[PDB]
Amino acid sequence: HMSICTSEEWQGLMQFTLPVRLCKEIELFHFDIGPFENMWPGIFVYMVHRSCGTSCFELEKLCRFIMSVKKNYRRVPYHNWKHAVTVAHCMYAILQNNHTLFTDLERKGLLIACLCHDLDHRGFSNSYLQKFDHPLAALYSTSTMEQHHFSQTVSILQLEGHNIFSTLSSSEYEQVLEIIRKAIIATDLALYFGNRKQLEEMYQTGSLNLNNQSHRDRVIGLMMTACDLCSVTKLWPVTKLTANDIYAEFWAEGDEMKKLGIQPIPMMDRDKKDEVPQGQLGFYNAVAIPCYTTLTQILPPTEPLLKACRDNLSQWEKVIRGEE
Ligand SMILES: [Mg+2]
Ligand SMILES: [Zn+2]
């Protein structure tokens, strides 16, 4: 059921060399992978090597894994291969700035979880799947697509010559799969609200403790949200172009809902584009800003993400004032 890369594809990646000029840019939070499409797989290899080490994974298996992952993302407007690499780069930047707070196993697991976190996304939301009783909603009662993404991740690792984690001890192997499962499930925004509220309380009361596994799981979960939403932390033109893709996907879902006799929420209605700026303001105030605010309190080095998010909030406010 999984697509598999070709030999030409993974061998090509093995020989790829990242232009020297980008080495410096990739370390920055605001880096936009957009203008370097042919280099995306190579950029991921580079980040894994820098964060985890050039020998952390057998190169041949890592290249097969990456190119097969790319082949299992669909040609949808937003939850595609570009989104996966963008989210993984944000994780790389967060890890580089907070390196020793995380174990080697966590860094490998998180970069991989980010690349695979939307695997086989079809362009439809959990709301849609559950509303119309898709088979996936029966199999996965909550966090439907996310449980599916994790299942797809395991399926790729099971492809011949694709298991980049086999060299881990049996104990660490189970530990990394759990890190990945929890990280992918955390990308279900439905869970973010409670996770952020809990973390803020733990932080403020001083009970937050990183040697407490349940606390670590929650911090990692907020990092996942922060990376998944990072388009709001790029330079405005980038943030604006990405929003176009996000809505293109939403509108296609809304179109299907109308065919089934259900009026879509305004956000998914292509006939209600005038409501988008206010909708963005609402998302930033209720989701994005609080997310990066709490992440910055827990991990000070991530402050640049919050500053960028605040700048974009101001940009959406300018749009509402008619200053676009
Ligand atoms: Mg997702
Ligand atoms: Zn995502």
How far is it, in rounded angstroms, from Cα 87 to Cα 66? 15
Domains of the chain: 1-324 (1.10.1300.10)
* Ramachandran bin of 103, using left for φ above 0, alpha for ψ from -120 to 50, beta for the remaining angles: beta
Ligand nearest to the CA of 229: 2
Question: Residue 228 annotated as binding?
Answer: yes
* Ramachandran bin of 269, using left for φ above 0, alpha for ψ from -120 to 50, beta for the remaining angles: beta
Residue 65 sits at φ, ψ, to 5 deg, of -60, -50
How far is it, in rounded angstroms, from Cα 142 to Cα 136? 10
CA of 221 to the centre of ligand 1 (A): 13
Largest CA distance in the chain: 59
Tokens of 230: 């990072």
Ligand nearest to the CA of 189: 1
Method used experimentally: X-ray
How far is it, in rounded angstroms, from Cα 246 to Cα 106? 29
How far is it, in rounded angstroms, from Cα 134 to Cα 310? 38
Question: 208, 214 in Cβ contact below 8 A?
Answer: no
DSSP string, 30-71: T---GGGGGGHHHHHHHHHHHHH-TTSS-HHHHHHHHHHHHH
Chain breaks in the chain (C to N over 2.5 A) after: none
How far is it, in rounded angstroms, from Cα 35 to Cα 150? 29
DSSP code at position 287: I
CA of 45 to the centre of ligand 1 (A): 22
Question: Residue 32 annotated as binding?
Answer: no
CA of 250 to the centre of ligand 1 (A): 13
Resolution in Å, one decimal place? 1.6
Sign of CA dihedral 134, 138, 142, 143: negative
Tokens of 235: 């330079």
Question: Residue 148 annotated as binding?
Answer: no
Amino acid making up residue 324: E
Ligand nearest to the CA of 145: 1
Chain center to CA of 30: 15
Ligand nearest to the CA of 185: 1
CA-closest candidate to residue 201, choices 75, 294, 73? 294
Annotated catalytic sites, by residue?
79
Residue with tokens 């990066």: 292
Chain center to CA of 180: 12
Secondary structure of residue 103 in the 3-state scheme: coil
HSE (CB half, 13 Å, CA atoms) of 230? 31
Tokens of 47: 């980040």
How far is it, in rounded angstroms, from Cα 24 to Cα 30? 12
Question: Residue 274 annotated as binding?
Answer: no
Question: 81, 38 in Cβ contact below 8 A?
Answer: no
Amino acid making up residue 156: I
DSSP code at position 80: S
- The count of other CB atoms within 10 Å of the CB of residue 320 is 12
How far is it, in rounded angstroms, from Cα 43 to Cα 71? 17
CA angle 50, 175, 293 (to 5 degrees): 65
CA of 206 to the centre of ligand 2 (A): 31
DSSP string, 151-169: HHHHHHHTSTT--TTTTS-
CA of 146 to the centre of ligand 1 (A): 6
Secondary structure of residue 29 in the 3-state scheme: coil
Question: Residue 118 annotated as binding?
Answer: yes
How far is it, in rounded angstroms, from Cα 313 to Cα 309? 6
CA of 268 to the centre of ligand 1 (A): 17
Q: Residues 6 or more apart from 180 whose CB is under 8 A from it? A: 109, 112, 113, 116, 150, 153
DSSP code at position 101: G
CA of 236 to the centre of ligand 2 (A): 20
Secondary structure of residue 135 in the 3-state scheme: helix
How far is it, in rounded angstroms, from Cα 160 to Cα 278? 49
CA of 65 to the centre of ligand 1 (A): 20
HSE (CB half, 13 Å, CA atoms) of 312? 31
Question: Residue 280 annotated as binding?
Answer: yes
How far is it, in rounded angstroms, from Cα 298 to Cα 48? 24
Q: Where are the alpha helices (DSSP H) in the chain?
A: 7-15, 20-25, 40-52, 59-71, 81-97, 104-116, 126-131, 135-139, 144-157, 170-186, 189-205, 213-228, 236-259, 276-283, 289-298, 303-320
- The count of other CB atoms within 10 Å of the CB of residue 133 is 9
- The count of other CB atoms within 10 Å of the CB of residue 268 is 22
C-alpha dist (Å) from residue 282 to 125, 266, 292: 19, 13, 15
